[PDB]
């Protein structure tokens, strides 16, 4: 059978470590072939017997009015029979289901094009330098910030045996290759060679879009160990899985329009295709195609003034009847209609079930957004210009980065600033005192002591619902979390909204029997956003760490214990810069970037209890358990 890519990759890595160049080239080539073969098999038969069995639908069957229950039962039975037939076909095709799944690190190393690095090293060691330069160019295109591979490429170019046209890219997708080449040709004022490449780019774009939409029906994504508490019914699990699948299908338009050579996906890919096409067609002299392309562009953006001037100019040049008879292109119309229907469904799901969705298209008409959602976008636009005015007043009267992005109102009264960022010797730092009183501290202490030690807010609410922990403390925890979120948003002059990422109430117990010869630090100095190292003092914003977290906060509930301090450290993980003293109601708020490496000392006799909070600026990566927490809070206390 077709062996999995990761086993071959491991064998090739081991052979490379030992020093067997034939082994590493053989294993790497086999892995590269196997991955593509498996992907092609999945695509092929998924498409083939998704098209083999259509959904049919029964419009002729009119449900019985009086006998509603039987009509509903039959309407459910037909759909589930069709579903069972499709599932049976898929099981017949795919065969072994364990060969298609591999870890996240393996997908990462296949995205970074490491096998091409190994292959180029092996090919140079074997004296097959043509494949060596091909692999080196592929890796350099994949990773553009690598000086070494640039040096090897320059050496190969100077050393005799390499040709200019041999630089082929073995990994980039087709539809992007003719697009960039076509645009480069168009920039040199050569419209004879521009139209065929661009028309091809359109065709392979549509083909690749259709291929990519068929690889999205994947496994459902549970939040860690949340599949042990999953108690959804049939028609709820089906809709949750389909909503995730629809999100994955709509996220392909922003993946087809991105390149590693750029740090941001292209803006308005298909409309830009049509714009360049109509410019080139006007330059050549073909007028009917220019008018058609202008119309099929204005279909997407109907209020673009310049394109309207171009269309009117072409219509004046041509005849009225000709410019009336020709219309847009049908594929763009079908694409637009299907995308609009998908966006409507996703926006309804976001409005009702509170499942976040961010539009990947800038041509979406406002008529598809519900009225409830259009008011939340209106308020966040009002407060985006409100904040930008305050920064303007700060600068007009005036190290800037410590004044124009700090110093907030601190809305709630009874709250002061014990330390600002200057006394704390750093940027993006604050120490507030008195966010809560002593009653809150005692109540949260009782809540965490009764049942324990990371306890979330959703689990605390569930336990209060059952009857184990008090409900008032479980509501106070929620209220204090929201209050701290708003305080953090207000102090740092954030304009875009601040979302929730994770939060757990914890307690640390110092056992007095392991303390002997405990010279090592309890917790290493590190950073939250990336993975801090110990040699080059540089961190990588890579998937094995959480790269979406932006802001962090710690709130302390007591001060009756010894040790266990909180100290900020420089990148060297040695030089302590500033330390804080835990007390009741003290909050430490810092940005979770690489400029704030922190560490906690070792605790001694006593108890330490605190709430750790992490926030994101990305609506995609939000706390998926906060929606259910809000749902529980709404029905238990405000029915």
């Amino acid at each position: 059978g077709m062996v999995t890519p990761d086993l071959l990759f491991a064998e090739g890595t081991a052979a490379y470590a030992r020093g067997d160049w034939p082994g590493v080239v053989l294993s790497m080539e086999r892995a590269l072939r196997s991955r593509a073969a498996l992907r092609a098999l999945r695509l092929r038969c998924r498409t083939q017997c998704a098209a083999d069995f259509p959904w049919e639908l029964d419009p002729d069957w009119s449900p019985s009015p009086a006998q509603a229950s039987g009509a509903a039962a039959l309407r459910d039975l037909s759909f589930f029979g069709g579903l069972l037939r499709r599932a049976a076909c898929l099981r017949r095709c795919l065969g072994p289901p364990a060969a298609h799944s591999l870890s996240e690190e393996m997908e990462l190393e296949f995205r970074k094009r490491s096998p091409y690095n190994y292959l180029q090293v092996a090919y140079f060691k074997i004296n097959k330098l043509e494949k060596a330069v091909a692999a080196a160019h592929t890796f350099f295109v994949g990773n553009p910030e690598h000086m070494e591979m640039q040096q090897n490429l320059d050496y190969y170019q100077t050393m005799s045996g390499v040709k200019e046209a041999d630089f082929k890219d073995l990994e980039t997708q087709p539809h992007m290759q003719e697009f960039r080449l076509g645009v480069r040709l168009y920039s040199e004022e050569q419209p004879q060679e521009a139209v065929p490449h661009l028309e091809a780019a359109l065709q392979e774009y549509f083909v690749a879009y259709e291929e990519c939409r068929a690889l999205c029906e994947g496994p459902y994504d549970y939040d860690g160990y949340n599949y042990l508490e999953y108690n959804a019914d049939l028609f709820q699990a089906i809709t949750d899985h389909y909503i995730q699948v629809l999100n994955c299908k709509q996220n392909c338009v922003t993946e087809l329009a991105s390149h590693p050579s750029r740090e941001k996906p292209f803006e308005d890919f298909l409309p830009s295709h049509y714009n360049y096409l109509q410019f080139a067609y006007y330059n050549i002299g073909n007028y009917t195609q220019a008018v058609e392309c202008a119309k099929t562009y204005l279909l997407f953006f109907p209020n673009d003034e310049v394109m309207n001037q171009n269309l009117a100019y072409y219509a004046a040049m041509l005849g009225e009847e000709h410019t009336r008879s020709i219309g847009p292109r049908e594929s763009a119309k079908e694409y637009r209609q299907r995308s609009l229907l998908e966006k409507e469904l996703l926006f309804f799901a976001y409005d009702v079930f509170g499942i976040p969705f961010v539009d990947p298209d800038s041509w979406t008409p406002e008529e598809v957004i519900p009225k409830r959602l259009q008011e939340k976008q209106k308020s966040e636009r009002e407060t985006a210009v409100r904040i930008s005015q305050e920064i303007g007043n700060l600068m007009k009267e005036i190290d800037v980065s410590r004044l124009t992005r700090e110093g907030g109102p601190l809305l709630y009264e009874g709250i002061s600033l014990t330390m600002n960022s200057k006394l704390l010797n750093g940027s993006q730092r604050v120490v507030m005192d008195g966010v809560i009183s002593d009653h809150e501290c005692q109540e949260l202490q009782r809540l965490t002591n009764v049942a324990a030690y990371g306890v979330t807010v959703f689990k605390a609410l569930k336990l209060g619902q059952e009857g184990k922990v008090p409900l008032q403390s479980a509501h106070l925890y929620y209220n204090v979390t929201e209050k701290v979120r708003r305080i953090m948003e207000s102090y740092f002059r954030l304009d875009t909204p601040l979302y929730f990422s994770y939060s757990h109430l914890v307690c640390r117990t110092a056992i007095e029997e392991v303390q002997a010869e405990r010279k090592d630090d309890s917790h290493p100095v590190h950073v939250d956003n990336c993975i801090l190292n110990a040699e080059t003092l540089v961190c990588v914003k890579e998937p094995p760490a959480y790269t979406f977290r932006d802001y962090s906060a710690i709130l302390y509930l007591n001060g009756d214990f010894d040790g266990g301090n909180f100290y900020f450290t420089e990148l060297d993980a040695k030089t302590v810069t500033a330390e804080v003293q835990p007390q009741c109601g003290r909050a430490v708020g810092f940005s979770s970037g690489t400029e704030n490496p922190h560490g906690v000392k070792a605790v001694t006799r006593g108890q330490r209890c605190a709430i750790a909070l992490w926030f994101t600026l990305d609506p995609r990566h939000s706390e998926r358990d906060r929606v259910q927490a809000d749902d529980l809070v709404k029905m238990l206390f405000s029915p």
């Binding site: 039987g70 049976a88 059952e466």
Partner: protein, 362 residues
């Protein structure tokens, strides 16, 4: 326990989670306290019945709700239509569930529900009743448990012991009863009492309640599952429904009344047979023919009813009977369709989708 029960106006003093009440009842039972255990067990039974009734009311709407006709542009994409309807139904269910008092507590686990569906609390109930001078209630609970489980040795022993005691020989009442069972019992009694009109009225009353109960029980089986495998979209939503179908199939035979220790085979066919005979004895052909057609639909291999139908066909042009009066009743057609489809779907599913990685231990 079920005398002072009302779904709409429920006493708010006893609104506690089912698991907590069951745990308290078991703890008091192990502590040699009888009255408190009896009260807590009765409260738990009432809570379970309230949960079932709330589920039925929640599925009364939402599931049986017409869909407004969509726009013309959506008619070319069937998958979007189907799953948009599914999303609308799910949202309606989510809205409806939050309003009911029974759904604002802590929902019990699956093992507690499985225990309550096996009628197991009645063992403790009858023991505590007997240990508290409640002998008629004790024999009623023993009979109620033995109706569901006719193969228990110890329960048979206590039933034989109770029967020997004088006096408690007429209080054999099933505590978990249904309206259609009683209506059918009176219908059969009147039919044997050579009375036709009363039997006709009772049977025509009893049929719709049985259909309503059957459809509610079918709708109440689409529950949750334990996650133990992570597969694709279709392959993972085609196993939840396999389990749901396994649960759905038994609903026809779980609602069949049992008289004399033996369930009544071919319940609906029996109703239609009794109705046809009662209508025949009153010479009401206009209402007697469709019963014969329905019985032939259910029991295809029959003799006397086939000759009856042939005789009715021969004399069709004398009673003023048209050609469309020899068609089966719509409810019987719906029942037949919804049973045949389920059985065929299970037979198909248990050849291609069900994994073959288990064997019989020998």
């Amino acid at each position: 326990q079920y005398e002072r029960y009302s779904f709409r106006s429920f006493p708010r003093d006893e609104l506690m989670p089912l698991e907590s009440a069951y745990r308290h009842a078991l703890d008091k039972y192990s502590g040699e306290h009888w009255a408190e255990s009896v009260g807590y067990l009765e409260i738990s039974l009432r809570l379970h019945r309230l949960l079932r009734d709330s589920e039925a009311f929640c599925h009364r709407n939402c599931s049986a709700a017409p869909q407004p006709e969509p726009a013309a542009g959506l008619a070319s994409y069937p998958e979007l239509r189907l799953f948009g309807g599914l999303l609308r139904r799910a949202h309606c269910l989510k809205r409806c569930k939050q309003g009911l008092p029974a759904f604002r507590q802590s929902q019990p686990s699956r093992e507690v529900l499985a225990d309550f569906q096996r009628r197991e609390p009645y063992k403790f109930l009858q023991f505590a009743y007997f240990k508290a001078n409640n002998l008629p209630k004790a024999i009623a609970a023993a009979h109620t448990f033995l109706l569901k489980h006719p193969d228990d040795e110890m329960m048979k022993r206590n039933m034989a012991y109770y029967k020997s005691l004088p006096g408690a020989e007429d209080y054999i009442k099933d505590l978990e009863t249904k309206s259609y069972e009683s209506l059918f019992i009176r219908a059969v009694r009147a039919y044997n009492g050579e009375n036709w009109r009363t039997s006709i009225t009772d049977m025509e009353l009893a049929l719709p309640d049985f259909f309503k109960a059957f459809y509610e029980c079918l709708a109440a089986c689409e529950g949750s599952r334990e996650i133990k495998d992570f597969k694709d979209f279709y392959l993972s939503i085609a196993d939840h429904y396999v389990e749901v179908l396994e649960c759905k199939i038994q609903c026809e035979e779980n609602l069949t009344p049992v008289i004399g220790g033996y369930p009544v085979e071919k319940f609906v066919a029996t109703m239609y047979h009794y109705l046809q005979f009662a209508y025949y004895k009153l010479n009401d052909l206009k209402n007697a023919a469709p019963c014969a057609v329905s019985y032939l639909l259910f029991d295809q291999n029959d003799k006397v009813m086939q000759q009856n139908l042939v005789y009715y066909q021969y004399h069709r042009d004398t009673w003023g009977l048209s050609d469309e009066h020899f068609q089966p009743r719509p409810e019987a057609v719906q029942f037949f369709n919804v049973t045949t489809l389920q059985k065929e779907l299970y037979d198909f599913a248990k050849e291609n989708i069900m994994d073959d990685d288990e064997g019989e231990v020998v």
